[PDB]
Structure 1
Amino acid sequence: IVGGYTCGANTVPYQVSLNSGYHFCGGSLINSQWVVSAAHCYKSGIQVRLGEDNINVVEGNEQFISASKSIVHPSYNSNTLNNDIMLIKLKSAASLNSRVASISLPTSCASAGTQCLISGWGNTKSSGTSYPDVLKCLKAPILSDSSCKSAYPGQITSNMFCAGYLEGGKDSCQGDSGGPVVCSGKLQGIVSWGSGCAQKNKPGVYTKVCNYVSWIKQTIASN
């Protein structure tokens, strides 16, 4: 996250870190046994890390649980990033309390102008590189479909939305991918892509979660 703030330990209790020896992507806990992340975060050997603040220090609220199964969206296209969503089942159920909690799925999509909270352990610089140990946060609005498509001609599908600031300086970034965009207590987006980070006229592009709730529920129901 570029231009954000330190969330506070365990203030974002649905935020997970995906670990393959190191943090590589974010995710969101949507029930005791399932995580949603980006399909471009897929790899084998994932350990899900719940209850994290400092990803490099054991602070006492962690749960580390191996993935038993990963499911990339049937129609994921890694060239266009259309349908950039995946589900991860945990080998055992997480213990849910105030510091580790699931986030509600939307019953309704979000509109332009709604404020949202975006979080992760991604790069904090837009020129150059600095990866934080503790979770970083950004409050950002959803942008209109038209300003999204104007920023990124021929690249925005009905499964994508823009959020952030066209002026630059405040965005998600590398390492935040797969993590949450939560608006009025609902998981509305997944950190997906963008040209650079926090660049003028190049806002963040997010997977539109409300399009996927049917798929998510039926997948959980049968796995």
Structure 2
Amino acid sequence: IVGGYTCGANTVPYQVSLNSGYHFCGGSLINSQWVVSAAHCYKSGIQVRLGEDNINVVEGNEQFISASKSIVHPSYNSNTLNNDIMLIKLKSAASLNSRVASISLPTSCASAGTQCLISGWGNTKSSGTSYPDVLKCLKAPILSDSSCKSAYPGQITSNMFCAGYLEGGKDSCQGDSGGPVVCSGKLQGIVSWGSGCAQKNKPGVYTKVCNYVSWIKQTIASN
């Protein structure tokens, strides 16, 4: 997260860290046994870490659970990043409490101008590399479809939306991938892609979760 602020220990209870000997992607807990993340975050040997703040220190409240299976959307296209969504089933159910809780799936899509909260342990610098120990937060608005498409001509599908600031200076970044974009208590987006980080006229692009609610529910029910 570039241009954000320190969230505060366990203030984002649904945020998860995907770990393979190091933090490589974010994710969101949607129920005691399932996590939603980005398809481009797929890899074998994933350990899901819940209840984290400082990812380099065991502070208490953490729950480390191995992923039993990862389900990348069947129509995911790695070249266009269309359908960049993945479901991860935990080997064992997580213990839900005030520090580890699930986030609700949307019942309808969010409109332009809606303020959302984006979080992650990704790079905090626009020009360079600097990974934080603690979770970072950023409040950002969903942009109009016209502004999104003018920023990324011919690259925005109906399963994507832009969020952030055109003036630059505030945006999600590498390492935030797969993380949550929560608006009014509902998970509306997944950190997917963008051009660089916090560059002017180049807002972040996110997977439009409201288009996948039926797919998520039907997939979870059959696994």
Offset at 1:37? 0.1
Offset at 1:24? 0.1
CA distance in 1, matches of 2:94, 2:50: 8
Q: Deviations over 1:7-40 (max 9, x none)?
A: 0000000000000110000000000000000000
Q: Who is 2:216 aligned against?
A: 216
Offset at 1:160? 0.2
Q: Deviations over 1:46-72 (max 9, x none)?
A: 000000000000000000000000000
CA distance in 1, matches of 2:89, 2:183: 24
SS in 2 for 1:98: coil
Offset at 1:118? 0.1
Q: Kindly tell me the number of residue pairs found equivalent between the two proteins.
A: 223
Q: Deviations over 1:86-123 (max 9, x none)?
A: 00000000000110000000000001000000000000
Q: Deviations over 1:132-189 (max 9, x none)?
A: 0000000000000000000000000000000000000000000000000000000000
SS in 1 for 2:10: coil
Q: Counterparts of 1:117-136 in structure 2 under 5 Å? A: 117-136=117-136
Stretches (4+) displaced over 2 A:
none
Q: Who is 1:10 aligned against?
A: 10
Q: Counterparts of 1:71-220 in structure 2 under 5 Å? A: 71-220=71-220
CA distance in 1, matches of 2:20, 2:129: 21
SS in 2 for 1:40: helix
SS in 1 for 2:220: helix
CA distance in 2, matches of 1:57, 1:21: 14
Q: Deviations over 1:69-92 (max 9, x none)?
A: 000001000000000000000000
CA distance in 2, matches of 1:74, 1:10: 33
CA distance in 2, matches of 1:213, 1:94: 22
Alignment RMSD: 0.3
Offset at 1:2? 0.1
Identify unmatched segments of 5+ residues in structure 2: none
TM-score, normalised with respect to structure 1? 1.00
CA distance in 2, matches of 1:104, 1:116: 14
Identify unmatched segments of 5+ residues in structure 1: none
CA distance in 2, matches of 1:173, 1:215: 27
SS in 2 for 1:65: strand
CA distance in 1, matches of 2:69, 2:129: 32
CA distance in 2, matches of 1:138, 1:102: 19
Seq. identity, %: 100
